[PDB]
């Protein structure tokens, strides 16, 4: 479930609009490289190094993401001055290191080696003005849904408060959002100048966003904790409008979206010549033979019917083809939820079905169905067809219990032809493999020790100690780590799997210690040997 500010447009398929409209964002990273940014306590990393790592993490994630967002980099406290606002003696020690453009590996390499800490100090509000200028002068022609400025500073140095009103007015008028990144977490031995700087930062954020403005002030530490993992795959499900029918006289306007699917990266490996390193140099030629070669001008379509070979052209097949009415969602009947076993769930998707957008009458009608099925512990058996061409399916539509939203969940059920009737030997009724009382007690102790759940405050509510559905797919994280490693270090072999990845794929360390003891008893009680 999304926030209320998230428009439904993102889910509806329109010509280069909605899902098809390129959601682009302009980001200006405003980094403090001033003298004080290098000054740190012998125990903790300098703000400069901390901010540098946050920025690298952000840019790295953006390089592999599909977003197409544009990134610029403004530095302040540098020895030199490179500004379109410099004039004579204004906005000094502020450098536009990178102009608004797609991030690349040349930027990341540049961040790592070319950016050095400065010996000067600059006005952070002046750096913000320069940052606003970048967005104002470079978003020209380009279509950006969002414009953001991220400021990384220690707030250690003096600054003028004279431009506060022009700063706020331009951010509001140009719809530019702001975010602050500091060495410390927002509530402490910060300087008096830092306390002054922070009050202004607080005022700015409150003027722009209100009470929620304070939530846009972060520590570099918390930012590194959130940016260390690669960006998970987020796609907007296309809005599927249709009518849920009960007989031929009752119709309910509905809108369905894909809840679950086997998500994958779109971009894959291109087979290229080992020498030219180009795609066009490789070509696939599929030939036909009986041994004796055959020309395309001599092949017809056919199908096998057991031992029979039946010639059937695509033209004839097109007309004799089964024809059904498309975009159909029809109730066949209702049954006990118990009669529909989850072991029979078929297909590659799960559909969440809501009432048609902005239709109260449809919403009430569907809410009636949802609650009736829930209160009767029943489900609907429906006929589902995506469009006029799509093969129809038989599936289940069951109620979904949440307080923020009510919906029917659609999952395909099998056809008789899909079921595989295999008989397996009874294990309960086995004279050979029945376990002893001691063996059963060891397994009982194992299951208790290896519990992945815990009851909080005796509220009879189970807290999952190992969720797995919150974990991002490690395949993508791994692919990206390697792709990045090969880009920055071409001579180096592929790196090993990062520890945090393994750490998230393993159960809590508590579970592992408890497991080993009953596991040891199991190894002695259950003899196991290869045949």
């Amino acid at each position: 479930m999304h926030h209320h500010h998230h428009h439904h447009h993102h889910h509806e398929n329109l010509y280069f609009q909605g899902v098809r409209s390129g959601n682009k964002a302009a980001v200006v990273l405003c980094m403090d490289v001033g003298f004080t940014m290098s000054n740190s306590i012998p125990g903790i990393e300098s703000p400069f190094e901390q901010a540098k790592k946050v920025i690298t993490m952000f840019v790295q994630r953006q390089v592999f993401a599909e977003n197409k967002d544009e990134i610029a980099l403004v530095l302040f406290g540098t020895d030199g001055t490179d500004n379109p606002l410099s004039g004579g003696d204004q906005y000094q020690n502020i450098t536009v290191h990178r102009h608004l453009m797609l991030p690349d590996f040349d930027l990341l390499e540049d961040i790592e080696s070319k950016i050095q800490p400065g010996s000067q100090q600059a006005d952070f509000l002046d750096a913000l003005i320069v940052s606003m200028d970048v967005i104002q002068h470079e978003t020209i022609g380009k279509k950006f849904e969002k414009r953001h400025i991220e400021i990384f500073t220690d707030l250690s140095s003096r600054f003028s408060k004279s431009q506060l009103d022009i700063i706020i007015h331009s951010l509001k008028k140009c719809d530019i959002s702001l975010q602050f990144f500091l060495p410390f977490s927002l509530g402490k031995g910060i300087t008096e100048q830092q306390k002054e700087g922070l009050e202004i930062v607080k005022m700015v954020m409150i003027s722009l966003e209100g009470e929620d403005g304070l939530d846009e002030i972060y520590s570099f530490s918390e930012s590194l904790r959130k940016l260390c993992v690669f960006k998970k795959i987020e796609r907007h499900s296309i809005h599927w409008p249709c009518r849920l029918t009960i007989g031929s006289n009752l119709s309910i306007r509905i809108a369905a979206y894909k809840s679950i699917l086997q998500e994958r990266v779109k971009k894959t490996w291109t087979v290229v010549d080992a020498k030219t390193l180009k795609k066009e140099d490789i070509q696939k030629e599929t030939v036909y033979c009986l041994e004796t070669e055959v020309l395309k001008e001599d092949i017809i379509q056919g199908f096998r019917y057991g031992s029979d070979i039946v010639p059937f052209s695509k033209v004839d097949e097109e007309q004799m083809k089964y024809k059904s009415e498309g975009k159909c969602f029809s109730v066949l009947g209702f049954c006990k939820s118990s009669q529909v076993q989850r072991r029979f769930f078929m297909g590659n998707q799960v559909l969440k079905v809501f009432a048609a957008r902005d239709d109260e009458a449809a919403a009430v009608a569907l809410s009636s169905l949802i609650h009736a099925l829930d209160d009767l512990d029943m489900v609907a058996i429906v006929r589902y067809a995506y469009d006029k061409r799509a093969n129809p399916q038989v599936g289940v539509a069951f109620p979904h219990i949440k307080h923020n939203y009510e919906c029917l969940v659609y999952v395909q059920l099998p056809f008789m032809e899909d079921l595989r009737q295999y008989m397996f030997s009874s294990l309960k009724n086995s004279k050979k493999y029945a376990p002893t009382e001691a063996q059963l007690n060891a397994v009982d102790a194992l299951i208790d020790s290896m519990s992945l759940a815990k009851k909080d405050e005796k509220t009879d509510t189970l807290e999952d100690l190992f969720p797995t559905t919150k974990i991002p797919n490690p395949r993508f994280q791994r692919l990206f780590q390697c792709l990045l490693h090969r880009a920055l270090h071409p001579r180096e072999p592929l790196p090993p799997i990062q520890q945090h990845i393994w750490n998230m794929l393993n159960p809590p360390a508590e579970v592992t210690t408890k497991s080993q003891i009953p596991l040891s008893k199991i190894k002695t009680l259950f003899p196991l040997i290869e045949a």
């Binding site: 926030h3 980001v27 969002k146 991220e150 959002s177 940016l227």
Partner: peptide, 7 residues
């Protein structure tokens, strides 16, 4: 709701 750098 993530914004700017985190979104």
């Amino acid at each position: 709701k993530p914004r700017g750098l985190f979104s």
